[PDB]
Amino acid sequence: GKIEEGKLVIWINGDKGYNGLAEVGKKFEKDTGIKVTVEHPDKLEEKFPQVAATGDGPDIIFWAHDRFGGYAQSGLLAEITPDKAFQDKLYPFTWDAVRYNGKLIAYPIAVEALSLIYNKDLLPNPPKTWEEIPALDKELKAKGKSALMFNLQEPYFTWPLIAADGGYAFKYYDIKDVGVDNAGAKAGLTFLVDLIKNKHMNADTDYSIAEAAFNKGETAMTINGPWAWSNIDTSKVNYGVTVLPTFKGQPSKPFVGVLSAGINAASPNKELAKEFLENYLLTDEGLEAVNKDKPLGAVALKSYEEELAKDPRIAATMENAQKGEIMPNIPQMSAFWYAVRTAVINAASGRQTVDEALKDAQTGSELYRQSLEIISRYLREQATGAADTAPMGASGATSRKALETLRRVGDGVQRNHETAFQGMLRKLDIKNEDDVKSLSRVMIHVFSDGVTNWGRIVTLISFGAFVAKHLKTINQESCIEPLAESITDVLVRTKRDWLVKQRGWDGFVEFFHV
Ligand SMILES: OC[C@H]1O[C@H](O[C@H]2[C@H](O)[C@@H](O)[C@@H](O)O[C@@H]2CO)[C@H](O)[C@@H](O)[C@@H]1O
Ligand SMILES: O=C(O)c1sc2cc(F)ccc2c1Cl
Ligand SMILES: [Cl-]
Ligand SMILES: [Mg+2]
């Protein structure tokens, strides 16, 4: 393979204590003679699936648990198999965050939740509600200070406020049911936009800018995680850590993250990675080394969390955590976060209204589950000849109308392309499920190679249905679902922005309206 044997390459995010992780890597290297190299690559969450998909990258990947299901679904992660005794050392709910389709896919490291961080010298008694912040800012502005600054370039920091009055990602599961553009999410984001409009916040504010302003004593409040406390210590700001403000009487609900360590599927050092993580990192001395660099929050190791739990900053973290919710690790979390990131930024800058911004994020977040439902039902009914009598569910009218339209249009497309599809199927060799995997690599390169329209999308799906029929014919009907997922994955990954612009399958329905 591409990844070197007899070495350990570890990737972790730049806001985390990588120097302390490196210290742990030095202890491993001292004992074993095996080199350990810690890196903190830019845009790590995107760079890992890119390089791992080619069989390259690090042996160990660090991130919050939410993106690991996507990595697993893409076959980028090795199943981890700790013994019972090691499992019993970590909190059961942390293992839950790294379980995907029955299988553990990472070692949970620490529980991360956003808190309100405030300057005691400027703000002795921090606001219990979001609604008193504008007035609080006015008071402070008279003294040369602002009330609140936090990163507005990542939806992670804004999500507590969005979710406060009833906003949610995926109902808890029902992945089809998405609450990104409901009334509560709209209210939450609207308040945020008004803070900006009324000059209480700046739309351009990011992580560095916010951190800098707070640690320089310029703003009385920031919103951040445990990892940030180190820099505030160095700045000597008299700071406190408390519960996030409420919005409309309801608690802010931070989407809780579990920093986890995964093992590259293509790593030839899986046993080494296992030794490092279990016997060097997930120890009292291991977790402390990292914690002393940048705080981890509430760690998964029971023995060490018992000592840290006494810290009122940790207690506050867990208080915010208990009011929020653990992230899903479903594969389309990446799409969700991207959709919401854009929505928050576009609303903040005025590029979009809150209503339209959230609608798009709603469509983006629905896109994979909506598309799979239609494509899977179409391929299955084309193969067997009989429709699925099961209710569509959430939405519902969109799924049903899109399938009707796909049937009508797809019939003429399959008839006309029958000779072309026969030729394409013979050129490939789809005998079993092992061959379905290869298909996506051929589709993705070809289908993304021109101007997009609904016509080409129907052709793709129709070839899907054609292959589905063939699979049933040769007694490989079990492959129809993986095929539908592969086609769906290709469609939604390569044409995401186009599809959103088209208002998703509503556009497909309208375009072919008879
Ligand atoms: O903003 C979207 C982003 O949210 C979370 O990322 C967090 C991460 O969990 C924290 O440990 C810390 O590094 O802050 C990040 C936000 O900048 C999700 O984990 C991530 O997948 C998502 O893209
Ligand atoms: O991108 C497109 O429009 C086309 S043309 C074509 C021909 C085939 F035999 C199979 C798929 C396909 C696809 Cl997608
Ligand atoms: Cl989960
Ligand atoms: Mg729209």
From Swiss-Prot:
Keywords (A to Z) from UniProt: Periplasm, Signal, Sugar transport, Transport
Induction and repression of expression: Induced by maltose and the transcriptional regulator MalT. Permanently repressed by cold shock in a PNPase-dependent fashion.
Subcellular compartments: Periplasm
Entry keyword Signal: yes
Location, primary (coarse class): periplasm
Family matches, as SUPFAM superfamilies: Periplasmic binding protein-like II
GO cellular component, one term: periplasmic space
S-S bonds: none
GO biological-process terms attached to the record: carbohydrate transport; cell chemotaxis; detection of maltose stimulus; DNA damage response; maltodextrin transmembrane transport; maltose transport
Gene Ontology MF terms: carbohydrate transmembrane transporter activity; maltose binding
PROSITE patterns recorded: SBP_BACTERIAL_1
InterPro entries linked: Maltose/Cyclodextrin-bd, SBP, SBP_1_CS
Known role: Part of the ABC transporter complex MalEFGK involved in maltose/maltodextrin import. Binds maltose and higher maltodextrins such as maltotriose.
Family label: Belongs to the bacterial solute-binding protein 1 family.
Quaternary data: The complex is composed of two ATP-binding proteins (MalK), two transmembrane proteins (MalG and MalF) and a solute-binding protein (MalE).
NCBIfam families, sorted: PRK09474.1
Descriptive protein name: Maltose/maltodextrin-binding periplasmic protein
Species of provenance: Escherichia coli (strain K12)
Lineage: Bacteria, Pseudomonadati, Pseudomonadota, Gammaproteobacteria, Enterobacterales
